[PDB]
Design a protein around this ligand. Structure first.
Ligand SMILES: CCCCCCCCCCCCCCCCCC(=O)OC[C@H](COP(=O)([O-])OCC(O)COP(=O)([O-])OC[C@@H](COC(=O)CCCCCCCCCCCCCCCCC)OC(=O)CCCCCCCCCCCCCCCCC)OC(=O)CCCCCCCCCCCCCCCCC
Ligand SMILES: CCCCCCCCCCCCCCCCCC(=O)OC[C@H](COP(=O)([O-])OCC[N+](C)(C)C)OC(=O)CCCCCCCCCCCCCCCCC
Ligand SMILES: CCCCCCCCCCCCCCCCCC(=O)OC[C@H](COP(=O)(O)OCCN)OC(=O)CCCCCCCCCCCCCCCCC
Ligand SMILES: NC(=O)C1=CN([C@@H]2O[C@H](COP(=O)(O)OP(=O)(O)OC[C@H]3O[C@@H](n4cnc5c(N)ncnc54)[C@H](OP(=O)(O)O)[C@@H]3O)[C@@H](O)[C@H]2O)C=CC1
Ligand code: SF4
Ligand code: SF4
Ligand code: SF4
Ligand SMILES: [Zn+2]
Lengths: 94, 154, 145, 94, 154, 114, 206, 176, 44, 290
């Protein structure tokens, strides 16, 4: 941000861009290095009632695998066939 | 006599520490922070430390990462081909003493089992700035050398 | 012309460092002849400067003292010479210097900062801090086989 | 509370010192034995006993969430003071 | 582990605002350079069928025209809530894979922009102290929180 | 007792592969000593080859013998192709290992190990 | 429920149906089929079925598992066949994943799947190196990760963590040498398991 | 959604063909590359003047370890060994006994700084803010042994750096 | 009140990402005309 | 035994051999092998050095962490000697020089310095003392080097009567000034291998019968110097230096049948034929033995 106007013009012309609008060095636009203290929120289990752990216990809802066949009609695929991707409307071609 | 030997020592020390050409053994992640030390923010070249030197033109080996048993012979071979004076900088926990992999069956527990080490840079990885501090510490070690004074007193 | 204003900016740095000798002193000690605002000085002689028109990272710097703890540091400066209260400011861990936000005082905090002591007689040497675990039986001091 | 053994080696706050015949003290020759001189047992003893009006007091070590887990100390015994198991501060019911 | 510090998102926005120009400068050096194209065009051609059988993934697949990206087909976290395009090569060579990576950087900035705008409030780890340790203030006040902290860290 | 074989269907078939491996190793030692510039003699190298083969002479399972041959051929390939370095070849000789005590009294004096 | 991973019954049903489908078509080899509560389909097969089963899943029009995501082994010493060989496959056509598992011991070869997936080449070398499972008809089976001349298969549960030998440079012989491992600080074994059952749903019958 | 990086057809009219001929013979795109590096020559460099200038860090930075005290001077550590248990590198070794006044305190507290991965788990695990990773990163040594910290070294670090350590904890403890 | 890092009310401004390689220079015809013109003057 | 020096381990790098050795002259040809063997089994080695620390770097990998300790010392400064030995259980003197310098003559290196080390070690209470002399040490020698060895050998015996004195022939090895000396170019020689000498020194520390004795370390074969030099040239594939050194090289190796040798320490002498290639390979029909 200290370059003379002539040097600013010279490097803008050489690069073909307006470099001064997007300098790769940081100045005053960066956030202060001292901030006010946070006050973070608490999660959904932070309740004084209607909050028994056995109703929100993910680990204990896990089950052993379902055995569908053990060595002790239409054809199917493992899932429906994948749908064709659509060409980008933002910019289909580079 | 004393004055000439001292001044000559200062001269050769200044030349050697002002022109430290490293061979970097970029073994693992510590090699990334070494690249950042060469990158513009720190620009190790501005200290006379060229970016990449050939092993036969090198004055300091930087061991930047985990030294495995499979790799250990090759690292020693490069060290032995270095022309003197030669120094070794151990970078990061892995090279310092095995680090996170200290108890592995395949890892050398510190590169100082293979080569003599001049400077140990701690961290996993050390920051590029920490490594630069270490390189400057090596420069100060070289500034303390008194090879000619000891030669004169033999 | 602009090149004229640049040249006078260079000259001002000579007088900004108290003449030619001070200008050359900072040029050879620190390879930098910028003039900044003096933020403060610590008990060891290090001086701290700021210039917020410089890009982030160059806006704060320290000119190390020429002598610390009995060591000549005119040429041999070290990053570990910055005491902790200024360490936070110089690394942009905070915005305000210890001259404006002094640290909390404790009786056990070192009054005298020490730089890296590796390679000196003051270097740290590790040792086991625990006492002997097994006590050997000591035979009697009189003959009696 | 640092004291030196007959051979001159400083004794640590854990009581460690190499005895007269131990070779291992050769490691300090030309260097130094690092010893911290602020013995915590001595420093905590200097703290005055705190006089309180209740049978039970609580201590979190000071600084709220910057201290230690909050514990409650019973002060019924009159022979001795109540001591915090985390920080060593002492309390007495007046 | 921790929530973002105040002010971080602003600085990420400042960085993202300028980054595409930096990609442009990189592209001005390489994309149309005839020497760069000589080194990468028609180099290491891999067919779509060979890429799949050899277990390739990522740009090694898409460079050869395969329309596959796990963020799109098997999404995780909130990738289903952000918009972006998958770059696809046509020749399956080094030059196309270089172009895909450069374009992927641009789409990363596109995703980053949406993340900054759509960042919601709330907690940053699961509110289940049998899995995620409690907040330090709770660990120092509540018996259950201290027990769970003790056990999760041992 | 009915198992899938590796290469050999019986010990006679397996013992053929052992002999073929032994010949390959026997003829490779002279080139190994030269290529790796080893300081051991060719006789030492062959004496080492024979010692390695002899400690496995008690095997009577053809599948185990097959794996030993499989592993022995990998070791030979590493050597002939100079994938090994000098350190790897000389590791067979334990030059820096001091001789451990074998008799009861010697073991008793130095430590607790059996 | 904010903290609980949601179920996906539609995918569970689809994967279960395809699992029966595979079991009906290759009864010669399929021993067990199961779908996990997080919807991952596993086919357990006799080791003879490796090539037929993988070929079917790669080539059949209702499978098209064209990509071998991973191939690995697991060591379970308590089993007569201690090594479990795991193939993880991906079908881009049907946007689906399947896992095929077989077993082997220390002396029984497994047929190399390189003919089906060229990707298997290095994965099988890694399994041989780390576990000692021999793959038959591999184009080039040899160690891939361990040092040259390394003895043993480190990923077996009974191979010690720090191994048996360690390396250092020896000045007398002017080379790196290998010697029995001595550790200045032994690795400290921790006994962490709680003596209280955590998951009743997985309780084994007594 | 997808896009093609490299699927375009060059225009085969005479003007376009002659444009590509001019680029081939007059090296136009190569000259355009020279303009970029020329424009960087006249940009201010990004280099900082280390060690007189330092890279910015934050209060969360994980550097050299230290053992902290209460304001009275009593040690915070009560030898619970949670840090030792969580340490992913097993870099911590602790022994403890009752102190002469009955306090639960350590007789050994070692960190092998060459095993440590500087992960910060120890300071997360600690219930009394005793062990912390401080802000110092400029502590390289000339020998391996100097990086094997015992309790005296770590207490000395705490006394040396407590002024900065406390302020950094003050800035970040509400995120913890 | 809860205070955590959030985007500004209304969100941040637009962020560019698309390739931007601006067209510069003359046409092939004009470039060749300048080059041949220089040669003719040099020859003369 | 003090508890710190009770042996533990399996004789490896991390073991505790129970030896605390101060090795003077550890930065030379012989010292690097002696330090290596001491550090192999986990001994504490104190290395007093006169040279730059850069010149001691090759000794650092020779021991586990903390097992090699370096100290500054001066041959003429008895305080520096006392600092180095006062914690040791054995002192090994390998100080020597094949020439004389402006500051040190053979009398300094081989008489005054060994006597000073032996005397301070005796004062400090060191239990063991190993002094290297020479097979051909002789008051009636043309070599001032060998004359000084005889005078110094006598002084050490008087000062430290329990000293173990070792008298090696010329030592061949990778860094020797013997085979290398010929390759860089009437008398019978019995050269001994460097590793044999090192093993003898290490075993003299352990063997309690070695105290007070004088040993002669010689190789298994005697050669004519002409036969040796011819063999050296053949092994080096080559077409077949002070004046004091010449006298030494031309001194017939003494035959001292009354002194114990390597076999009395459990060491088998290595033939020159086995190890000659090792020394001479870098300069690129066995010699007739008596
Ligand atoms: C070609 C050389 C032309 C000579 C003139 C150069 C000049 O003065 O420009 C600097 C001046 C400042 O550059 P800037 O990047 O825009 O501003 C950055 C800061 O504002 C800079 O200002 P600041 O605010 O940062 O203030 C700090 C600075 C203020 O800066 C200065 O004081 C300027 C110092 C430059 C003096 C150069 C003297 C030229 C001598 C010619 C002989 C050398 C060549 C052989 O003060 C100093 O640090 C002084 C340190 C002295 C450094 C050594 C300079 C002497 C070099 C010659 C040594 C001979 C012995 O630039 C201009 O004013 C524009 C005109 C300059 C000519 C540009 C032509 C470019 C080439 C065309 C393209 C061809 C490419 C192939
Ligand atoms: C042919 C003759 C070449 C003479 C070279 C003289 C080098 C000048 C010099 O030493 O630089 C100043 C240097 C500068 O000191 P410095 O190298 O310590 O640098 C300190 C400043 N920072 C922190 C930025 C690195 O002076 C010395 O170092 C003292 C030793 C003098 C060496 C020359 C002996 C003659
Ligand atoms: C009226 C009658 C008139 C009669 C006379 C008419 C003659 C004039 C009209 C014709 C103009 C002739 C131009 C001659 C220049 C040489 C052109 C040339 O050779 O370029 C082709 C070469 C290869 O091109 P490429 O894309 O790789 O593939 C083509 C073949 N497959 O591409 C290259 O050479 C690339 C060069 C690679 C080196 C890169 C580094 C250089 C870049 C900076 C160059 C700066 C310019 C030099 C100026 C020097 C100043 C002293
Ligand atoms: N090598 C042989 O053929 C034989 C040798 N010996 C004896 O064995 C011993 C060692 O042999 P070698 O290892 O070849 O000797 P070297 O010359 O190879 O090394 C000699 C050692 O003595 C030190 N030293 C020499 N002069 C001084 C001094 N003035 N003050 C302090 N230290 C000094 C050197 O240190 P620096 O590097 O600092 O000078 C070096 O470490 C010597 O006593 C030698 O005479 C006996 C018979 C045969
Ligand atoms: S020390 Fe840390 S960063 Fe460096 S190589 Fe090892 S694990 Fe990677
Ligand atoms: S930072 Fe991590 S690796 Fe280092 S001591 Fe703490 S828990 Fe262990
Ligand atoms: S530092 Fe903290 S976690 Fe570690 S033992 Fe001490 S009190 Fe426990
Ligand atoms: Zn308390």
């Amino acid at each position: 941000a200290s370059a003379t106007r002539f040097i600013q013009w010279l490097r803008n012309w050489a690069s073909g861009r307006d470099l001064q609008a997007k300098l790769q060095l940081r100045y005053q636009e960066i956030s202060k290095r001292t901030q006010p203290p946070p006050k973070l929120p608490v999660g959904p289990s932070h309740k004084l009632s209607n909050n028994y752990y056995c109703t929100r216990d993910g680990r204990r809802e896990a089950m052993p695998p379902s055995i569908v066949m053990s060595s002790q009609k239409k054809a199917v695929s493992p899932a429906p066939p994948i749908k064709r991707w659509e060409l980008s409307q933002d910019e289909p071609y580079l | 006599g004393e004055y000439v030997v001292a001044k000559l020592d200062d001269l050769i020390n200044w030349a050697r520490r002002s022109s430290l050409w490293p061979m970097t053994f970029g073994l693992a992640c510590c090699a990334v922070e070494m690249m950042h030390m060469a990158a513009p923010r720190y620009d190790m070249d501005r200290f006379g430390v060229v970016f990449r030197a050939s092993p036969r033109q090198s004055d300091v080996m930087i061991v930047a990462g985990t030294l495995t048993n499979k790799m250990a012979p090759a690292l020693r071979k490069v060290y032995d081909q270095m022309p003197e004076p030669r120094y070794v900088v151990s970078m990061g926990s892995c090279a310092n003493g095995g680090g996170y992999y200290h108890y592995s069956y395949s890892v050398v527990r510190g590169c100082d089992r293979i080569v003599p080490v001049d400077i140990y840079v701690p961290g996993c990885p050390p920051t590029a700035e920490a490594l630069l501090y270490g390189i400057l510490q090596l420069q100060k070690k070289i500034k303390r050398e008194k090879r000619l004074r000891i030669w004169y007193r033999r | 012309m602009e090149l004229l204003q640049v040249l006078k900016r260079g000259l001002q740095q000579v007088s900004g460092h108290g003449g030619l000798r001070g200008y050359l002193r900072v040029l050879f000690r620190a390879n930098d002849v910028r003039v900044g605002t003096l933020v403060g000085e610590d008990k060891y002689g290090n001086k701290y400067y700021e210039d917020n028109k410089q890009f982030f990272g160059r806006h704060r710097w320290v000119i190390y003292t020429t002598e610390m703890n009995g060591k000549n540091t005119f040429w041999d400066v070290d990053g570990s010479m910055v005491p902790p209260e200024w360490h936070r400011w110089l690394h942009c861990m905070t915005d305000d210097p210890p001259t404006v936000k002094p640290p909390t005082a404790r009786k056990f905090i070192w009054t005298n900062h020490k730089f890296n002591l590796s390679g000196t007689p003051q270097q740290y040497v590790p040792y086991s801090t625990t006492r002997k675990k097994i006590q050997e039986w000591v035979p009697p001091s009189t003959p009696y086989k | 509370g640092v004291r030196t053994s007959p051979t001159g080696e400083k004794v640590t706050h854990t009581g460690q010192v190499y005895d007269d015949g131990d070779y291992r003290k050769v490691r300090f020759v030309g260097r130094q034995k690092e010893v911290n001189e602020n013995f915590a047992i001595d420093l905590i003893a200097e703290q005055p006993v705190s006089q309180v009006g209740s049978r039970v007091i609580s201590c979190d070590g000071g600084g709220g969430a910057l201290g230690h887990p909050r514990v409650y100390i019973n002060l019924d015994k009159e022979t001795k003071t109540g001591t915090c198991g985390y920080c060593g501060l002492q309390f007495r019911q007046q | 582990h921790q929530d973002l510090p105040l002010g971080l998102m602003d600085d990420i926005y400042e960085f993202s605002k300028n980054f595409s120009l930096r990609i442009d400068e990189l592209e001005e050096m390489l994309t149309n350079n005839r020497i760069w194209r000589n080194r990468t065009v028609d180099i290491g051609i891999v067919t779509a069928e060979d890429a799949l059988n050899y277990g390739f993934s990522g740009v090694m697949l898409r460079g050869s025209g395969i329309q596959w990206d796990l963020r799109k087909t098997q999404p995780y976290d909130v990738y289903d809530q952000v918009e972006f395009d998958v770059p696809i090569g046509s020749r399956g060579d080094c030059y196309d894979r270089y172009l895909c990576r450069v374009e992927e950087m641009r789409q990363s900035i596109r995703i980053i922009s949406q993340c900054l705008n759509k960042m919601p409030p709330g907690e940053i780890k699961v509110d289940d102290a049998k899995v995620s340790p409690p907040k330090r203030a709770e660990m120092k006040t509540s018996m259950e929180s201290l027990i769970h902290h003790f056990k999760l860290y041992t | 007792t009915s198992v899938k074989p590796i290469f050999s269907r019986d010990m006679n078939e397996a013992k053929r592969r052992v002999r073929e491996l032994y010949r390959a190793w026997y003829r490779e030692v002279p080139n190994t000593v030269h290529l790796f510039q080893l300081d051991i003699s060719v006789k030492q190298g062959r004496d080492k080859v024979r010692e390695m083969f002899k400690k496995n002479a008690h095997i009577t399972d053809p599948r185990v013998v097959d794996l030993l041959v499989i592993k022995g051929k990998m070791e030979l390939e590493e050597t002939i192709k100079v994938w090994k370095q000098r350190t790897h070849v000389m590791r067979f000789f334990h030059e820096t290992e001091a001789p451990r005590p074998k008799d009861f009294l010697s073991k008793f004096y130095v430590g607790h190990d059996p | 429920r904010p903290t609980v991973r949601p179920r996906n019954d539609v995918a569970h049903k689809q994967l279960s149906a395809f699992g029966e489908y595979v079991a009906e078509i290759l009864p010669k080899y399929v021993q067990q089929v199961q779908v996990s509560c997080f919807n991952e389909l596993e086919i357990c097969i006799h080791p003879d079925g490796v090539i037929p089963v993988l070929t079917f899943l790669r080539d059949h029009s209702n499978a098209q598992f064209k990509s071998l995501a991973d191939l690995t082994a697991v060591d379970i010493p308590t089993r007569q066949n201690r090594f479990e060989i795991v193939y993880n496959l991906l079908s881009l056509r049907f946007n689906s994943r399947i896992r095929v598992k077989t077993y082997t011991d220390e002396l029984t070869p497994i047929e190399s799947s390189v003919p089906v997936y060229k990707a298997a080449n290095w994965y099988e070398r890694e399994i041989w190196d780390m576990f000692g499972v021999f793959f038959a008809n591999h184009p080039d089976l040899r160690r891939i990760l361990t040092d040259y001349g390394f003895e043993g298969h480190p990923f077996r549960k009974d191979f010690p963590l720090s191994g048996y030998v360690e390396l250092r440079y020896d000045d007398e012989v002017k080379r790196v040498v290998a010697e029995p491992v001595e550790l200045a600080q032994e690795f400290r074994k921790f006994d962490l398991n709680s003596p209280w059952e955590a998951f009743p749903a997985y309780r084994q019958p007594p | 959604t997808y896009k093609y990086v490299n699927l375009r057809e060059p225009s085969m009219d005479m003007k376009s063909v002659t444009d590509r001929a001019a680029q081939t013979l007059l090296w136009t795109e190569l000259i355009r590359g020279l303009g970029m590096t020329l424009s960087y020559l006249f940009r201010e460099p990004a280099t900082i003047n280390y060690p007189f200038e330092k890279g910015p860090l934050s209060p969360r930075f994980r550097g050299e370890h230290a053992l902290r005290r209460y304001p009275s001077g009593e040690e915070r550590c009560i030898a619970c060994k949670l840090c030792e248990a969580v340490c992913p590198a097993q870099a911590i070794t602790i022994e403890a006994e009752p102190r002469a006044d009955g306090s639960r305190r350590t007789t050994r507290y070692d960190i092998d700084m060459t095993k440590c991965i500087y992960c910060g788990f120890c300071q997360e695990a600690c219930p009394v803010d005793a062990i912390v990773e401080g802000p110092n990163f400029e502590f390289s040594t000339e020998t391996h042994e100097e990086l094997l910290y015992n309790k005296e070294k770590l207490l000395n670090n705490g006394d040396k750096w407590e002024a900065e350590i406390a302020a950094n904890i003050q800035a970040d403890y509400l995120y913890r | 009140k809860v205070k955590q890092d959030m985007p500004p009310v209304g969100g941040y401004g637009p962020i560019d990402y698309k390739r931007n390689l601006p067209r510069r220079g003359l046409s092939g015809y004009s470039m060749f005309a300048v080059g041949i013109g220089a040669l003719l003057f040099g020859y003369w | 035994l003090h508890h710190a020096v009770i042996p533990h381990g399996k004789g490896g790098r991390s073991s505790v051999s129970g030896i605390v050795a101060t090795v003077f002259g550890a930065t030379g040809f012989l010292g690097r092998y002696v330090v290596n063997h001491l550090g192999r089994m986990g001994s504490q080695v104190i290395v007093p050095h006169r040279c730059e620390p850069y010149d001691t770097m090759h000794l650092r990998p020779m021991g586990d962490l903390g097992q090699i300790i370096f100290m500054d010392w001066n041959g003429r400064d008895k305080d520096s000697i006392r600092r180095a030995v006062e914690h040791s259980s054995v002192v090994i003197n390998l100080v020597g020089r094949e020439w004389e310098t402006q500051n040190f003559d053979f009398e300094d290196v081989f008489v005054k310095i060994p006597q000073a080390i032996a005397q301070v070690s005796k004062e400090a209470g060191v239990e063991k003392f190993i002094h290297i002399s020479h097979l051909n040490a002789d008051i009636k020698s043309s070599s001032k080097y060998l004359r000084s060895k005889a005078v110094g050998e006598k002084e050490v015996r008087e000062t430290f009567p329990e000293a173990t004195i070792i008298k090696p022939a010329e030592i061949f090895g990778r860094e020797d000034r013997f085979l290398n000396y010929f390759a860089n170019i009437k008398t019978v020689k019995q050269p001994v291998y460097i590793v044999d000498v090192t093993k003898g020194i290490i075993n003299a520390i352990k063997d309690p019968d070695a105290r007070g004795k004088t040993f002669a370390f010689v190789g298994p074969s005697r050669y004519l110097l002409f036969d040796l030099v011819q063999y050296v040239f053949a092994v080096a594939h080559r077409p077949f230096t002070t004046r004091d050194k010449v006298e030494r090289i031309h001194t017939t190796d003494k035959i001292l049948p009354h002194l114990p040798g390597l076999e009395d320490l459990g060491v088998e002498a290595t033939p020159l034929e086995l190890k000659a290639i090792e020394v001479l390979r870098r300069h690129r029909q066995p010699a007739k033995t008596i």
